[PDB]
């Protein structure tokens, strides 16, 4: 079986699994589900959700509980149970950093500050955050990560595990960097030539970066640390490896230290890409509920040099519709956090209550992509795709003729598909033209892939999709030529029925149920 690999070409990206583009329709467990006895509280949710990939931690403390004494009993059970359910895995290496801290490091690491030193603040006080300049800390992490990859090289020949996250939400809360003596000698020294050359900057940290020197130095040493662990593992088994970011608010971030300083935040991606060339991608962990902020994050993390992977998102209802713009940007995956029944909710980040209705909000949007996952993945890499979500958030208690026209206008989205445009509208009947009022709660979205100049693959959810010509036609009229509902079977299109009459007179109207359409448009002469 070919190794999984992240391909980047012509500003576009694909996660190759078993030799073809793949989309992670994921779920991540809660943080304490990384034990054989927890797995029975994970699989039922994964099945109800229709997820094709599970993200789950493997902690340094569990595989190396005493220095040099490795224990992979958890990984064995996990691999076997995942294979029985025919799902893939993303392993999350919880090690030097998990949410800025060494809590998942073994006791012999996290209780031995002199061997494995912490960030020191400017006032001499210590924070519970391991210094990225700790050379012993890097050697020890790297050694254990190598043993994990050696386990997968020997025990996972078919690559049940398709990708590994190196650390979890690196960085530091409460300070901008390490101000220890060890760190201060590096800060006061010259910025490395390799970084000065990659950013095309004149050649110390204070000298070249001014007001940003402290935050860029921490981002740099953390990125170098993560890059060395990653090379060490990839030398054993060259799987896709990525880092997940504790995001700063892209519109009003506040100061580094109030957000996790040093992580792959939107102001330091240029440092991260220069310092960590062996890390495949930098992934946003999204817990902003509001459409404008999430849209800004997807825009910031979708780059020619950065495949979009929504490595975590909140598991509350409003988050499910962000799958559509994720995929529309060419994203490789989407992974709601806390999808297990281990009696924990991360509300107010996620759902207040975890039940079947919490799962069902993601299951309903996964049901649109699962039936075409391989076809969609190839179209997003090789061609043109689009995706949108309902752009107004649910009406707040605070907020509850003119405001109705304003909302109808905001709930109307235009997409340029070449010779044709689509107009996507939310929260209206399946007949006539009464203007959009939005879904309660906000939930709708749409996917479109171009098959040919006049032919699109369309699936949507609680929305109307209407096509029209992109450019003024000259003495010509236009019509839908044919709408077919169907499915892909062994890579071939199988028609179930033709949508026509009422089903195409008022756009293409979608409810909560899955329907995959092929839409062929035509301009025709009336001369
Ligand atoms: C909203 S914000 O972007 O401003 N920051 C507040 C969010 C606090 C940190 C979020 C942690 C989050 N990602 C890492 C997971 O392992 C897990 O800890 C999870 C929370 O359940
Ligand atoms: Na893609
Ligand atoms: Na056009
Ligand atoms: Na146009
Ligand atoms: Na169908």
The DSSP secondary structure of 458-492, one letter per residue, reads EEEESEEEEEEESS--SSEEEEEEEEEEEEEETTE
Name the method of structure determination. X-ray
168 in ligand 1 pocket by Cβ < 6 Å? yes
CA of 225 to the centre of ligand 2 (A): 28
Contacts 24+ apart (CB under 8 A), 397-406: 404/435, 404/437, 405/435
* Bridge partners of residue 312, in order along the sequence: 285
**CA–centroid distance, residue 393 to ligand 5 (Å):** 29
Q: Which atom of ligand 1 is nearest to 287's Cα?
A: 1
CA–CA gap between residue 508 and residue 404 (Å, rounded): 23
- 3-state DSSP call for residue 386? strand
Count Cα atoms within 13 angstroms, Cβ side, for 224.
15
Ligand 1 centre distance from Cα of residue 285 (Å)? 7
Contacts of 269-274 spanning 24+ positions with Cβ under 8 A: 269/300, 269/301, 269/303, 269/306, 270/199, 271/195, 271/199, 271/216, 271/219, 271/220, 271/223, 272/219, 272/223, 272/243, 273/305, 273/306, 274/194, 274/195, 274/198, 274/199
| Pick from 281, 172, 179, 273: nearest CA to 223 | 273
Instruction: Specify the resolution in Å.
Output: 1.6
CA-closest candidate to residue 365, choices 389, 346, 391: 389
**What is the gyration radius of the CA atoms in the chain, in angstroms?**
25
Indicate whether residue 31 lines ligand 1 (CB < 6 A).
yes
Measured in angstroms, how far is the CA atom of residue 288 from the centroid of ligand 5? Answer: 33
Write down the domain spans for the chain: 1-371, 372-527
Backbone angles phi, psi at 140, to 5 degrees: -70, -45
Say how many CA atoms lie within 13 Å of 228 toward its Cβ. Answer: 18
* Distance from C-alpha of 282 to C-alpha of 268, rounded to nearest angstrom: 11
> How many CB atoms neighbour CB 426 within 10 A?
30
Residue 247 in contact with ligand 1 by CB distance below 6 A: yes
Residue 153 and residue 237 in contact, taking contact as beta carbons nearer than 8 Å: yes
Task: Determine contact, residues 439/461, Cβ cutoff 8 Å.
Answer: no
């Amino acid at each position: 079986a070919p190794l999984p690999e992240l391909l980047s070409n012509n500003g576009k990206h694909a996660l190759m699994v078993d030799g073809a583009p793949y989309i992670i329709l994921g779920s991540q467990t809660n943080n304490s589900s990384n034990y054989p006895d927890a797995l029975k509280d994970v699989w039922p949710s994964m099945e109800k959700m229709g997820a094709n990939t599970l993200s789950i931690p493997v902690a340094w403390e569990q595989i190396e509980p005493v220095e040099g004494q490795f224990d992979f009993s958890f990984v064995d059970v996990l691999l076997k149970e995942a294979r029985q359910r025919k799902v893939r895995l993303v392993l999350l290496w919880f090690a030097t950093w998990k949410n800025n801290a060494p809590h998942y490091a073994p006791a012999w690491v996290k209780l031995d500050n002199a061997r494995f030193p912490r960030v020191v603040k400017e006032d001499g006080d210590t924070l519970n955050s391991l210094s990225p300049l700790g050379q012993n800390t890097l050697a020890a992490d790297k050694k254990a990560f190598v043993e994990l990859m050696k386990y997968l090289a020997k025990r996972d020949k078919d690559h049940t595990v398709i990708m590994v996250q190196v650390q979890n939400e690196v960085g530091t809360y409460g300070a901008v960097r390490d101000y220890s003596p060890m760190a201060q000698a590096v800060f006061n020294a010259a910025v490395p030539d390799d970084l000065i050359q990659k950013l095309q900057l004149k050649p110390t940290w204070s000298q070249v970066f001014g007001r940003d020197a402290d935050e860029f130095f921490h981002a740099y040493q953390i990125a170098r640390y993560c890059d060395e662990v990653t090379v060490a593992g990839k030398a054993i088994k060259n799987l896709p490896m990525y880092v997940n970011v504790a995001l700063r608010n892209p519109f009003n971030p506040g100061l580094p230290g109030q957000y996790s300083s040093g992580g792959g935040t939107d102001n330091v991606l240029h440092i991260w890409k220069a310092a960590a060339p062996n890390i495949d991608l930098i992934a946003p962990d999204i817990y902003f509920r509001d459409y404008k902020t999430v849209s800004k994050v997807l825009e910031l993390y979708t780059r020619p040099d950065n495949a979009l992977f929504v490595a975590e998102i909140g598991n509350d209802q409003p988050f499910a519709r962000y799958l559509f713009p994720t995929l529309g940007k060419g994203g490789i995956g989407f992974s709601p956090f806390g999808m297990d029944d281990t009696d924990y909710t991360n509300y107010p980040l996620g759902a207040k209550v975890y039940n079947d209705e919490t799962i069902e909000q993601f299951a309903q949007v996964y049901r649109l992509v699962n039936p075409m996952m391989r076809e969609w993945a190839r179209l997003s890499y090789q061609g043109q795709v689009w995706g949108v979500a309902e752009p107004l958030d649910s009406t707040t208690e605070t907020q509850k003729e003119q405001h109705k026209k304003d909302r109808a206008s905001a709930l109307t989205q235009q997409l340029d598909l070449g010779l044709w445009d689509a107009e996507v509208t939310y929260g209206r009947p399946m007949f006539w033209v009464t203007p959009p009022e939005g879904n309660t709660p906000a939930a709708g979205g749409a996917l479109i892939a171009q098959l040919d100049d006049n032919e699109y693959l369309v699936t949507a959810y609680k929305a109307r999709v209407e096509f029209k010509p992109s450019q003024e036609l000259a003495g010509k009229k236009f019509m839908i030529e044919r709408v077919e509902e169907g499915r892909f079977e062994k890579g071939k299109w199988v028609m179930e029925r033709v949508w026509n009459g009422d089903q195409t007179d008022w756009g293409l109207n979608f409810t909560d149920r899955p329907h995959l359409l092929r839409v062929k448009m035509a301009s025709y002469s009336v001369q």
